Each structure stands twice: as C-alpha cells, then as structure tokens.
Amino acid sequence: GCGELVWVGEPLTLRTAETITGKYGVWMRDPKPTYPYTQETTWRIDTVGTDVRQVFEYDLISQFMQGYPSKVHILPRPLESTGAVVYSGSLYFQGAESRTVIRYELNTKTVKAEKEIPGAGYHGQFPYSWGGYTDIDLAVDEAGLWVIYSTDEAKGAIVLSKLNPENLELEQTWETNIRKQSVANAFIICGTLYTVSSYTSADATVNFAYDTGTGISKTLTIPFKNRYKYSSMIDYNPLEKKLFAWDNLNMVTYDIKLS
Ligand SMILES: [Ca+2]
Ligand code: NA
C-alpha cells in the first residue's frame, strides 16, 4: 500500500566499486520487468568521466553482488550524470551535454524514443547540491515514469513532470518551491516528491515533501545517513519499496516505511 514516508533505515552496502570510474554512478532494477529480465536483473553504470557508455547487466542478484556482469551494453550515445532509470524493459537516460531523454530498449539494444525536456536546464544549470551535472533526474514510482528538473521560468525550483513511457510525451507538470541546487537529491514515492538535505552528512534528513495530489509542501526531519559521505544518486524503487543509492563507490539500499 501507499502512504507518506515516515522512516528510512540504515544503508546496506551491496557492492563496492573498485576503481575511481565508480566514485559516482547509478544502479537500478526494473519495477515492471519484462522478458527476458526478472525482478532480480540489475543494471550498473559507473558514471565518472566524459564518454560514459558502458552499462553492466546482471541476470542475478548474486552476480551483481559478487561477480562479473552477464552482459555489457555499449550505449549508442554517451550518458549524462546519475539520474537514469530502468522501466518496463527500457533504460531512460539523458544524453551527454543535452536536455534530451533517450529510451533505450535493452532486449533489442534499440533507441525507441527521444524527447527534449522543454525548458529544462542542463549541464550544470540546475544540478543538485553536489554538482555532477545532475540537472535532470528520472524517477519511477507506483504510477510510472517521471522526470525531475528545473527551468528558468521556475527560477531553479524543482519541477516534476509525469512522462509517457512509450513516447516520452509530458503528461502533467508540477512546480515546487524547493531550490533544486539546495538539496542533495530527490525521489518520488506514491506521487510525493521527497528531497534529501545533504550528500555528505551521517546525520542528513529527508527534509521536504511536495504532494502532487494535493499541491501541499511540507518540511520533514526523517534521518538519512550518507555512510560514505558522498551520495551522488538517490532513487526509489516502487516494486522493492526501497531507496537505491550510490555513495562514494558504494551501491547501497535503504528500507523505508510508509504511513
Ligand atoms: Ca533521484
Ligand atoms: Na533517477
């Protein structure tokens, strides 16, 4: 069931990158898996550098945690930053040095859709507080695919839009009052956007919420620990009902509780 976020557990480390290429990155699973993948399939992208194209795919959680990839994809266009997601068989990622979101179908290794996010800042205009060109952050929740960004019209406040996952059309858009560059990252649970206060602190918080169903903004004080002091990626997986994050070489997960 759905509800308001009221608690975040301790970070559990599932895998640690062994080279600087993985200081920051994104790892994820598909909340709507489709053949030939399952809910165990895991994708990992080490995102340090300027020509990021390698996506590590693991059929089994055991492989993700202890072994080599079962397949490596080479994306047809380099990828920007840590905001990508996998949803219903496709990797949704941002093209390097662009405001373009690309739908890359994993089974066929084929680009199925591309869309400029209208007005979105990119490449260091509205990053989260750590930088990293994190201007555009994709999200999956219980209702499907979203994108988190900002625009000049919004004066850098977080904007979020629901996306058509087939053709990337924007279906609805909400504007918050939260300065995107003032928070460490964000994610969406049950239609509510949440932000994290700090990417370095062991004593950070989930500090703001914006409910797209009611339009109401709130402050929160839910503890959030950056165990390794440099969180580059914090997303929510609605199938596992957990946070997935990347913290200074470490792929970590957090349990949650909803009201
Ligand atoms: Ca995020
Ligand atoms: Na994301």
Residue numbers in the entry: 244 to 502
Paper lines:
Myocilin has no known function, and there is no glaucoma phenotype in Myoc knockout mice or in individuals with a homozygous N-terminal truncation mutation or hemizygous deletion of MYOC, but rare non-synonymous coding mutations lead to toxic intracellular sequestration of misfolded myocilin. However, not all mutations in MYOC cause glaucoma, and common variants are expected to be neutral polymorphisms. Among the common features associated with pathogenic myocilin misfolding, we demonstrate that a single metric, OLF thermal stability, can robustly segregate benign from early-onset disease variants.
Illustrative of this latter group is E352K, a variant documented in gnomAD as appearing predominantly in the African or African American population. E352K has been computationally predicted to be pathogenic and has been documented both in primary open-angle glaucoma (POAG) patients and in control groups, yet exhibits WT-like secretion. Structural integrity was further confirmed by high-resolution crystal structures, which were solved for 11 OLF variants. No gross changes from WT OLF were detected for the structures of T293K, R296H, L303I, V329M, S331L, E352K, T353I, K398R, A445V, V449I or K500R, indicating that these mutations are accommodated within the native five-bladed β-propeller fold and do not perturb the dinuclear calcium-containing site. Similarly, the finding that E352K does not exhibit characteristics of misfolding is consistent with the later age of diagnosis of glaucoma for patients with the E352K variant and a lack of clear Mendelian inheritance pattern. Most of the patients with E352K are of African or African American ancestry, a group more prone to developing POAG.
